[PDB]
Symmetry: D2
Subunit: 345 residues, 4 copies
């Protein structure tokens, strides 16, 4: 009845399979999927041992989703069949203190209630159709290209969230360091330019990726190696960086972040790569804050899409078919994706 990309066996690769076409229950909506982004978080999930994997098998992947509204569940109002929409991913209960400010990413009853994001417990977007639990998890696209913008649902939303949180500690004329210019990173750079006055130093491990970072707005680019810290120190007059966004989050990138963050600065550990930053006296500088944020808010998604509309941010897309999804994931693990891999089913 419909085609989809699923994780089905622990330690195995994602596979294109045929599954039932779902029907919207009451409250729910079905989208005909127009675009679906691939995220390195998916590689992280599939790289988990059986004892640590909690999302059930099979799992349709894909938590960056956009589409056209296909069918309405019982009692649904707010959207009409035919509306083009992006999917807000980090679902929450809707009612707690956090959910009420739109910050369903920090919902305090989601684990207890078994609420799970699409592609991370609930059925994802890498399919011809998908279900969304509730109308508040849908944002209008207007006449934004779904393929061009779908990744703003995470590749944009997540670093935007990290940046907005950090703005107090990034005055104009301060310096922001971005470690990793990939899916999130290449959007992170653009977002720092759009809404701060900060000088942006990007880092990565291919010249080719550094060149894209330069073009996307990075004032300075640097290889992520042993020299990085000292060059960043030189670039900031020895003061260090007011803000550091680590989009890798390995021990070594975190170590780098610790050596270059300024007095009173902030480190957002965005990338999930196995490290921790030892925060405390004589480890991190005085006044320096460290945080590992997760995804972002409903308002923030809308805001990121509005930046797309205004031409202030865009995704560098590498386009694929549904059948190529496995192939594309292999490319992503190998580091041969330029920007974001996006599937059009």
């Amino acid at each position: 009845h419909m085609r989809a990309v699923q994780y089905r066996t622990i330690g195995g690769e994602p596979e294109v399979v045929e599954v039932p076409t779902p029907e919207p229950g009451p409250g729910q909506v079905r989208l005909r999927v127009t675009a679906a982004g691939l995220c390195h978080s998916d590689s992280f999930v599939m790289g988990l041992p059986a004892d640590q994997y909690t999302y059930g098998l099979p799992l349709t992947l894909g938590h960056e989703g956009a589409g056209v509204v296909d069918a309405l569940g019982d009692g649904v109002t707010g959207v009409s069949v035919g509306d083009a929409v992006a999917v807000y991913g980090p679902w929450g209960c809707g009612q707690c203190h956090a959910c009420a400010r739109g910050a369903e990413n920090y919902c305090t009853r989601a684990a207890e209630l078994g609420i799970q994001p699409p592609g991370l417990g609930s059925p994802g977007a890498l399919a011809e159709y998908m279900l969304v639990d509730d109308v508040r998890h849908l944002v209008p696209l207007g006449d934004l290209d779904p393929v061009a913008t779908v990744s703003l649902t995470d590749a944009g939303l997540t670093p935007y969230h990290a940046i907005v949180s950090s703005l107090g500690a990034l005055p104009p004329g301060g310096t922001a360091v971005v470690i990793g210019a990939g899916g999130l990173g290449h959007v992170a750079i653009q977002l720092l330019r759009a809404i701060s006055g900060a000088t942006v130093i990007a880092l990565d491990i291919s010249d080719e990726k550094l060149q894209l970072a330069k073009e996307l707005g990075a004032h300075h680019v640097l290889r992520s190696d042993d020299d990085a810290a000292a060059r960043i120190r030189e670039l900031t007059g020895g003061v260090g960086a007011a803000a550091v966004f680590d989009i890798v989050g390995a021990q070594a990138t975190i170590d780098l972040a610790r050596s270059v963050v300024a007095i009173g600065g902030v480190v957002q550990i965005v990338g999930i790569g196995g490290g921790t930053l030892p925060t405390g006296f004589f480890s991190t500088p005085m006044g320096a804050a460290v945080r590992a944020p997760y995804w972002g808010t409903r308002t923030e998604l809308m805001e990121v899409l509005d930046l797309a509309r205004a031409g202030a941010v865009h995704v560098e897309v590498e386009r694929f078919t549904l059948d190529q999804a496995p192939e594309a994931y292999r490319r992503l693990h190998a580091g041969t994706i330029r920007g974001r891999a996006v599937v059009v089913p």
Copy 2:
């Protein structure tokens, strides 16, 4: 001993005159003036009746000052002879709650203590030399061109201050309206682009000035006439503008601001033009805030200069000599200055 531009007779024009070269008292510094901006606030001061004028005669004009440090007063440390510096203008006591956060513009003991800005009570910058009361009112220029950047001391500082105050009410994807694209206005536009994601609508009364506004970053430009409000309504989907910066502040521009500010929006009345905005229920929308800010903070000046360094903002300058200062002021009143008039003595 030195040449200067002064206001000497009520209702009269500024004149080039010869005066004593001042010597720095203890705490004070003398600058050899490298650049001096002209502001429409000066026209406002000289247009005051005798009973309302409080700055004493004669008065050397010019509150946008930059220079090279010429001589040190007794006990001065912090600066060296030869340092290039911008002058922070809205002087305060240094010690009250406001002064301590750097916001000497909102100093609560300045009037009581007779503290007055250079060119607005104290001797100004339109001269070959000038005195600054204290070292904390000097900011380093580095290798910024004094002539290009001097006006960032007010033409930049003032609207930057207004914008920073308003950022909470300007999410990315909201709309900011700028009424008046003159000295402050043409910098205001650039600053909104540098540090917000907001769509900028500029307004003015010459096509020529609107064209410069477009080039400087305004997404949309509009003649400031009877149609303005409805076009702004159309441009925002009928919601109105999240923020309005009125750099004219006449009753009519204020009236315009009131008709277009959105629910929960903000109006910064920056221009001094004789009006007031009737703020209250069924006059201003629910949640809408109105403010008449003054100048800006010490940190904000530094921040604006750092934006100049990073190429994010600049002043469109029209250059003059000291002898042409009167001529230049006539031009400013007539509306035939492109950006900012700057004198080099």
Copy 3:
């Protein structure tokens, strides 16, 4: 089938009448009403000429509602029959930028969509039963006394909102002025003590009401008369008040607010009493902001109720029956209610 208090004829008084007991449509919930507060906003609505009145006749009054969940509409989840809940009143669309941060009070599509608060267009709480449009407009009471706390839905929520907005301009050791110690006012005073370090000056026109204000936390109380401004000036060392909350909002109380707000201060015009504050240069001080807020946010309601739980705030209640509702409204207009009139049907 059920008893209710309605406004039925323009210029007439509210009447106890018998109406149909409503049934919950899909999405909706019915409450058995445990308490219903009376607000002076209701007097304002009933005092409107026919051409300005937009809520339709008849209208069941009462926008401060609490209850026990009586029946669930089709497809409703989140609440169970038997749950004790407060009603969040300033309803919005749920989906716009403002609604998504919980600030349905500043919803930008409510007027267009005909969305109306209970007791202010939709059927209110002064009845044995009431309908709520959606589950997100219900907050749990836990084991808070509905009668004691119901007025926190507006009498608390509204000034809390005004205070939270103003906190940046109320450092500890600054002074907050509260003009009017009535339903909102007597809670406003308590809230300023709970969550700021500000010295509180309350004002009113009866000694008896001033005495309650003193007891509820006001550091200083003053008759609202010609001497008020100078006493407030003396009390602040001539600086003025960092924040002023006018809970009357008549021209004279607004005039008072203008004369006493400090440089860089803020005025929240909370009371609806026909005035406007002329905001602008030489009318309001430099940096002073003026705002007419409306109600508050979803998070703020929860926060106010949590303060009640912690014993940090309470409502001084004057208790009535449904039959006494008209009588109680007469008392409120005459100024002989101590704190808040609350009806228990």
Copy 4:
């Protein structure tokens, strides 16, 4: 010429000694010391090995200072002989971006320029007289008791700073945990009550100290032991604490802080006790921030003193003479000081 308490030999105890009475150089002021607080930071400094100790020998101790102005240095204005003043301790350059907002605690040129706080490099307050570098490091006392309030210069200032930084993450009705109810801790508790709506859970290791914490405003007190985490979990409905202030900062107290901080919460590591908090994914919860703040700002000091004036905070003082300073330090290390040890010379 004058008596003072100094650290003179590595690993040795502080001694009362006779030294020259200092004279104010230009810019400087001499205080006749009216009170001098003892801080556990001093124990930390004296417990340092020779290779890690950087403050030179001898060193007059005492960084909580208050006094009466005794003599003016050359060119000093702002203060008069006879003015009662508290000493702002975390000195900075005065001119950098941080210093300009008053945050000399986060000055980015202090280490480079050898600027050192009184009692932590510069000569301290535990003496009959002391020198202050500049007038901006003095705050007026008014008619506050120097002995009662002197410790607000650090015991108050430091946690106030930590709390103010955390307020965004402490809505009213959230929970704040304070680990350690000593000099800073017992003020921290009061400050959380004064300026937030948060429920306060204090912890310590003596019943006697816990009892004082209860009296000073702690809603709940708990022994700092193996049960602490679970009781805190029970007390917050399993959500955890929105904010945790660790005033011990040992590995075990930091471990406790990590287990109880909520999703989106914040940990301020205030105490210097040798630990670090491993901040990062699956170590700290999503959105949780960790920071090790240092001292506070100029505005914050003023604000804390203004809270004292208003009766909102006070120091529980244990009074000593200069000769008893060594004895008092022994007591502090042994944990037999109730609140703050204060010396009156």
